[PDB]
Ligand binder design. Structure first.
Ligand SMILES: COc1ccc(NC(=O)Nc2cccs2)cn1
Length: 165
């Protein structure tokens, strides 16, 4: 199972790790993707998870979008986890760099509550432009299910742990 995670709360754990490498090792039931509404997995966690699936995630996502249209900011969809997980929960956190509403971050994390356990990144952090300390705070105050957070950046990981209230 998940190893080397620091316990933050009863249900939130954190580790300085590459979510692609964590997913290939654990093969969790659910890996969360930091998706956009179009499921265009270009960069950040999305680009990395998609590249690990040899673009199979993007092919499946384009078929999903062709059928269903775009997701909502704060929304999600469950697709295959390919070689990474049983399922991938594609969750759209607000992208502050695209001028999206930061209040939608709590709605985005609510999607995690539909799954007992998840391997996940911090939503809206990194290239999405939100403050990762705020994202972790919203995560621990919103998610009630077991969430194993993988934070790629070591310095950010240390900052998150040392400032956690
Ligand atoms: C948040 O941005 C990222 C970017 C990259 C990553 N992981 C990777 O790229 N992993 C790779 C495995 C093998 C070859 S490259 C995670 N997070």
């Amino acid at each position: 199972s998940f190893s080397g995670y620091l316990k933050l709360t009863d249900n939130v754990y954190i580790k300085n790790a590459d979510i692609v490498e964590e997913a290939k090792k654990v093969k969790p039931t659910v890996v969360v993707n930091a998706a956009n509404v179009y499921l265009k997995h270009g960069g950040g966690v999305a680009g990395a998870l998609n590249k690990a699936t040899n673009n199979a995630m993007q092919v499946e996502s384009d078929d999903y979008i062709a059928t269903n249209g775009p997701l909502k900011v704060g929304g999600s969809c469950v697709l295959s986890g390919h070689n990474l997980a049983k399922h991938c929960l594609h969750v759209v956190g607000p992208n502050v760099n695209k001028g999206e509403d930061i209040q939608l971050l709590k709605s985005a994390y609510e999607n995690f509550n539909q799954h007992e356990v998840l391997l996940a990144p911090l939503l809206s952090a990194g290239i999405f432009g939100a403050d990762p300390i705020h994202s972790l705070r919203v995560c621990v105050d919103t998610v009630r299910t077991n969430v194993y957070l993988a934070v790629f950046d070591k310095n950010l990981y240390d900052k998150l742990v040392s400032s956690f209230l």
